[PDB]
Protein backbone atom coordinates (compact mmCIF):
# COMPACT_ATOMS: atom_id res chain seq x y z
CA UNK A 1 0.00 0.00 0.00
CA UNK A 2 2.62 2.51 0.75
CA UNK A 3 5.51 1.24 -2.23
CA UNK A 4 4.79 1.30 -6.32
CA UNK A 5 5.06 -1.98 -7.54
CA UNK A 6 7.46 -2.79 -11.01
CA UNK A 7 7.31 -5.29 -13.12
CA UNK A 8 10.54 -6.21 -15.53
CA UNK A 9 9.01 -6.83 -19.16
CA UNK A 10 9.68 -10.55 -18.55
CA UNK A 11 8.17 -10.00 -15.01
CA UNK A 12 5.26 -9.08 -16.10
CA UNK A 13 4.72 -11.35 -18.92
CA UNK A 14 5.27 -14.27 -16.42
CA UNK A 15 2.72 -12.47 -14.16
CA UNK A 16 0.23 -12.38 -17.32
CA UNK A 17 0.99 -15.86 -18.48
CA UNK A 18 -0.08 -16.86 -14.94
CA UNK A 19 -3.19 -14.67 -14.47
CA UNK A 20 -4.61 -17.39 -17.89
CA UNK A 21 -3.17 -20.41 -16.71
CA UNK A 22 -2.37 -20.83 -12.74
CA UNK A 23 -4.58 -17.51 -11.09
CA UNK A 24 -3.39 -19.63 -7.59
CA UNK A 25 0.15 -18.19 -8.63
CA UNK A 26 -1.52 -14.84 -9.28
CA UNK A 27 -2.86 -14.93 -5.77
CA UNK A 28 0.51 -15.81 -4.05
CA UNK A 29 2.54 -13.25 -6.16
CA UNK A 30 0.05 -10.32 -5.14
CA UNK A 31 0.35 -12.11 -1.00
CA UNK A 32 4.08 -12.14 -0.79
CA UNK A 33 3.42 -8.47 -2.64
CA UNK A 34 2.21 -6.95 0.23
CA UNK A 35 4.27 -9.22 2.76
CA UNK A 36 7.16 -7.33 1.12
CA UNK A 37 5.40 -3.85 1.72
CA UNK A 38 4.65 -4.52 4.90
CA UNK A 39 7.82 -5.94 6.34
CA UNK A 40 10.70 -5.54 4.23
CA UNK A 41 12.64 -7.44 1.97
CA UNK A 42 13.51 -10.21 4.22
CA UNK A 43 10.85 -11.41 6.68
CA UNK A 44 7.89 -13.30 6.00
CA UNK A 45 6.18 -15.63 4.02
CA UNK A 46 7.64 -17.98 1.23
CA UNK A 47 11.29 -18.59 3.17
CA UNK A 48 12.96 -15.15 1.55
CA UNK A 49 16.62 -15.03 0.55
CA UNK A 50 19.05 -12.98 -0.40
CA UNK A 51 19.35 -14.04 -4.23
CA UNK A 52 22.60 -16.33 -5.25
CA UNK A 53 24.07 -13.40 -7.06
CA UNK A 54 27.61 -11.80 -7.49
CA UNK A 55 25.44 -8.49 -7.30
CA UNK A 56 23.69 -7.29 -4.24
CA UNK A 57 20.22 -5.98 -3.58
CA UNK A 58 18.51 -8.83 -4.80
CA UNK A 59 15.63 -11.02 -2.59
CA UNK A 60 13.87 -14.05 -3.64
CA UNK A 61 10.64 -15.59 -2.31
CA UNK A 62 8.92 -19.06 -3.34
CA UNK A 63 5.77 -18.63 -4.84
CA UNK A 64 5.72 -22.62 -5.26
CA UNK A 65 8.05 -25.50 -4.74
CA UNK A 66 9.19 -24.81 -9.12
CA UNK A 67 9.00 -20.61 -9.17
CA UNK A 68 10.37 -17.68 -6.71
CA UNK A 69 9.48 -14.55 -7.18
CA UNK A 70 12.88 -12.04 -7.44
CA UNK A 71 12.16 -8.37 -6.47
CA UNK A 72 14.58 -5.11 -4.80
CA UNK A 73 13.07 -3.30 -2.58
CA UNK A 74 14.38 0.63 -1.96
CA UNK A 75 12.34 3.65 -0.80
CA UNK A 76 10.20 4.42 -3.54
CA UNK A 77 8.96 0.41 -5.34
CA UNK A 78 9.26 -2.99 -5.23
CA UNK A 79 11.04 -4.12 -8.33
CA UNK A 80 10.21 -7.47 -9.88
CA UNK A 81 12.68 -9.00 -12.20
CA UNK A 82 10.98 -12.63 -12.41
CA UNK A 83 8.53 -14.62 -11.05
CA UNK A 84 9.47 -17.84 -12.52
CA UNK A 85 13.10 -18.08 -11.34
CA UNK A 86 15.03 -21.01 -9.94
CA UNK A 87 17.88 -21.62 -8.93
CA UNK B 1 8.38 -5.65 -24.04
CA UNK B 2 10.44 -2.97 -23.87
CA UNK B 3 9.36 -0.66 -20.24
CA UNK B 4 8.64 -1.98 -17.39
CA UNK B 5 5.49 -1.54 -15.75
CA UNK B 6 5.06 0.59 -12.43
CA UNK B 7 2.08 -0.21 -10.46
CA UNK B 8 0.75 3.12 -7.72
CA UNK B 9 -0.49 1.56 -5.05
CA UNK B 10 -3.85 3.13 -5.92
CA UNK B 11 -3.57 1.35 -9.14
CA UNK B 12 -2.45 -2.27 -7.89
CA UNK B 13 -5.47 -1.98 -5.93
CA UNK B 14 -7.23 -1.06 -9.21
CA UNK B 15 -5.71 -4.15 -10.95
CA UNK B 16 -5.77 -6.47 -8.26
CA UNK B 17 -9.98 -5.54 -8.04
CA UNK B 18 -10.62 -6.39 -11.27
CA UNK B 19 -8.71 -9.48 -11.07
CA UNK B 20 -11.04 -10.43 -8.57
CA UNK B 21 -14.17 -9.08 -10.42
CA UNK B 22 -13.34 -8.95 -13.89
CA UNK B 23 -10.73 -10.74 -15.51
CA UNK B 24 -12.05 -9.05 -19.44
CA UNK B 25 -10.80 -5.74 -17.73
CA UNK B 26 -7.79 -7.17 -16.37
CA UNK B 27 -7.18 -8.04 -20.22
CA UNK B 28 -8.31 -4.80 -21.65
CA UNK B 29 -5.77 -3.11 -19.61
CA UNK B 30 -3.05 -5.29 -20.68
CA UNK B 31 -3.55 -4.72 -24.15
CA UNK B 32 -3.61 -1.00 -23.72
CA UNK B 33 -0.22 -1.32 -22.06
CA UNK B 34 0.91 -3.15 -24.83
CA UNK B 35 -0.42 -0.63 -27.12
CA UNK B 36 1.68 2.13 -25.19
CA UNK B 37 4.66 0.49 -25.01
CA UNK B 38 4.81 -0.18 -28.86
CA UNK B 39 2.85 3.24 -30.12
CA UNK B 40 3.91 5.78 -27.60
CA UNK B 41 1.69 7.08 -24.91
CA UNK B 42 -0.77 8.99 -27.48
CA UNK B 43 -1.13 6.45 -30.31
CA UNK B 44 -3.29 3.50 -30.43
CA UNK B 45 -6.41 1.84 -29.01
CA UNK B 46 -8.20 3.31 -26.23
CA UNK B 47 -8.77 6.79 -27.46
CA UNK B 48 -5.92 8.48 -26.10
CA UNK B 49 -6.15 11.43 -23.99
CA UNK B 50 -3.97 13.71 -22.09
CA UNK B 51 -4.84 14.53 -18.76
CA UNK B 52 -5.21 18.23 -17.89
CA UNK B 53 -5.99 18.14 -14.61
CA UNK B 54 -4.23 16.95 -11.11
CA UNK B 55 -1.69 15.31 -11.88
CA UNK B 56 1.21 16.90 -14.61
CA UNK B 57 2.36 14.89 -17.92
CA UNK B 58 -0.35 11.80 -17.23
CA UNK B 59 -2.58 10.61 -19.87
CA UNK B 60 -5.39 8.34 -19.87
CA UNK B 61 -7.11 5.35 -22.34
CA UNK B 62 -10.36 4.26 -22.34
CA UNK B 63 -10.80 0.39 -20.16
CA UNK B 64 -14.63 0.77 -20.54
CA UNK B 65 -17.37 3.10 -20.50
CA UNK B 66 -16.80 4.24 -17.26
CA UNK B 67 -13.00 3.29 -16.42
CA UNK B 68 -9.86 4.79 -17.80
CA UNK B 69 -6.26 3.83 -17.61
CA UNK B 70 -4.50 6.80 -16.54
CA UNK B 71 -0.15 6.79 -16.72
CA UNK B 72 2.63 8.39 -18.10
CA UNK B 73 5.62 7.63 -19.54
CA UNK B 74 9.82 7.53 -19.72
CA UNK B 75 11.93 5.74 -21.43
CA UNK B 76 12.20 3.34 -18.55
CA UNK B 77 8.88 2.46 -17.64
CA UNK B 78 5.06 3.39 -17.72
CA UNK B 79 3.86 4.42 -14.38
CA UNK B 80 -0.13 4.08 -13.76
CA UNK B 81 -1.53 5.92 -10.95
CA UNK B 82 -5.41 4.57 -11.69
CA UNK B 83 -7.30 1.91 -13.36
CA UNK B 84 -10.62 3.49 -12.39
CA UNK B 85 -10.42 7.38 -13.26
CA UNK B 86 -13.51 8.96 -14.58
CA UNK B 87 -12.96 12.79 -15.42
CA UNK C 1 -11.74 -25.19 -10.47
CA UNK C 2 -8.98 -22.96 -8.17
CA UNK C 3 -11.90 -21.17 -5.31
CA UNK C 4 -13.06 -23.17 -2.48
CA UNK C 5 -16.80 -23.58 -2.63
CA UNK C 6 -18.29 -22.29 1.15
CA UNK C 7 -22.14 -22.99 1.68
CA UNK C 8 -23.59 -21.41 4.63
CA UNK C 9 -26.38 -23.75 6.61
CA UNK C 10 -28.93 -21.74 4.97
CA UNK C 11 -27.56 -22.22 1.41
CA UNK C 12 -26.36 -25.63 1.79
CA UNK C 13 -29.74 -26.64 2.98
CA UNK C 14 -31.13 -24.64 0.13
CA UNK C 15 -29.18 -26.24 -2.31
CA UNK C 16 -29.78 -30.06 -1.01
CA UNK C 17 -33.71 -28.79 -1.22
CA UNK C 18 -32.62 -28.14 -5.15
CA UNK C 19 -31.20 -31.40 -5.14
CA UNK C 20 -34.35 -33.69 -3.90
CA UNK C 21 -37.10 -31.14 -5.43
CA UNK C 22 -35.72 -29.56 -8.38
CA UNK C 23 -32.64 -30.67 -10.12
CA UNK C 24 -32.71 -28.48 -12.80
CA UNK C 25 -31.91 -25.39 -10.01
CA UNK C 26 -28.68 -27.24 -9.22
CA UNK C 27 -27.59 -27.77 -12.67
CA UNK C 28 -27.93 -23.40 -13.04
CA UNK C 29 -25.94 -23.23 -9.35
CA UNK C 30 -23.26 -25.44 -9.87
CA UNK C 31 -22.31 -23.72 -13.87
CA UNK C 32 -22.88 -19.86 -11.75
CA UNK C 33 -20.05 -21.04 -8.99
CA UNK C 34 -18.05 -22.27 -12.31
CA UNK C 35 -18.41 -19.08 -14.22
CA UNK C 36 -17.69 -16.93 -10.84
CA UNK C 37 -14.20 -18.79 -10.52
CA UNK C 38 -13.32 -18.29 -14.46
CA UNK C 39 -14.28 -14.88 -15.14
CA UNK C 40 -14.62 -12.79 -11.51
CA UNK C 41 -17.62 -11.99 -9.84
CA UNK C 42 -19.28 -9.86 -11.74
CA UNK C 43 -19.00 -11.38 -14.82
CA UNK C 44 -20.50 -13.92 -16.92
CA UNK C 45 -24.16 -16.24 -16.95
CA UNK C 46 -26.56 -14.97 -14.36
CA UNK C 47 -26.78 -11.39 -14.77
CA UNK C 48 -23.97 -10.33 -12.17
CA UNK C 49 -24.94 -7.78 -9.98
CA UNK C 50 -23.32 -6.20 -6.91
CA UNK C 51 -26.56 -6.70 -3.69
CA UNK C 52 -26.88 -3.29 -2.35
CA UNK C 53 -26.76 -4.40 1.06
CA UNK C 54 -27.72 -6.60 3.75
CA UNK C 55 -24.28 -7.61 3.74
CA UNK C 56 -20.95 -6.22 2.54
CA UNK C 57 -19.61 -6.96 -0.71
CA UNK C 58 -22.30 -9.97 -1.88
CA UNK C 59 -23.12 -10.17 -4.99
CA UNK C 60 -25.99 -12.03 -6.53
CA UNK C 61 -26.77 -13.97 -9.87
CA UNK C 62 -29.82 -14.88 -11.34
CA UNK C 63 -30.43 -18.65 -10.95
CA UNK C 64 -34.24 -18.79 -12.28
CA UNK C 65 -37.39 -16.63 -12.65
CA UNK C 66 -37.62 -16.07 -8.69
CA UNK C 67 -34.53 -16.48 -7.22
CA UNK C 68 -30.90 -15.03 -7.02
CA UNK C 69 -28.08 -16.71 -5.88
CA UNK C 70 -26.16 -14.19 -3.28
CA UNK C 71 -22.23 -14.87 -2.97
CA UNK C 72 -19.21 -12.83 -2.05
CA UNK C 73 -15.73 -13.73 -2.98
CA UNK C 74 -11.90 -13.34 -1.65
CA UNK C 75 -8.65 -15.02 -2.52
CA UNK C 76 -9.70 -18.37 -1.03
CA UNK C 77 -13.32 -18.79 -1.68
CA UNK C 78 -16.64 -18.32 -2.87
CA UNK C 79 -18.96 -17.68 0.01
CA UNK C 80 -22.84 -18.90 -0.64
CA UNK C 81 -25.35 -16.78 1.59
CA UNK C 82 -28.47 -18.29 -0.19
CA UNK C 83 -29.81 -20.04 -3.11
CA UNK C 84 -33.53 -18.79 -2.59
CA UNK C 85 -32.87 -14.75 -2.58
CA UNK C 86 -35.39 -12.44 -4.13
CA UNK C 87 -35.42 -8.41 -3.25
Known amino acids: ARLNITFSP ?12 DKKMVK ?5 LKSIDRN ?13 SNLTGYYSRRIN ?12 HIKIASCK ?3
Chains 1, 2, 3 share one sequence.
Open 10 to 21: QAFEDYKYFQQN
Open 28 to 32: KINEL
Open 40 to 52: GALEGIGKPEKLK
Open 65 to 76: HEHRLVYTVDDN
Open 85 to 87: YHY
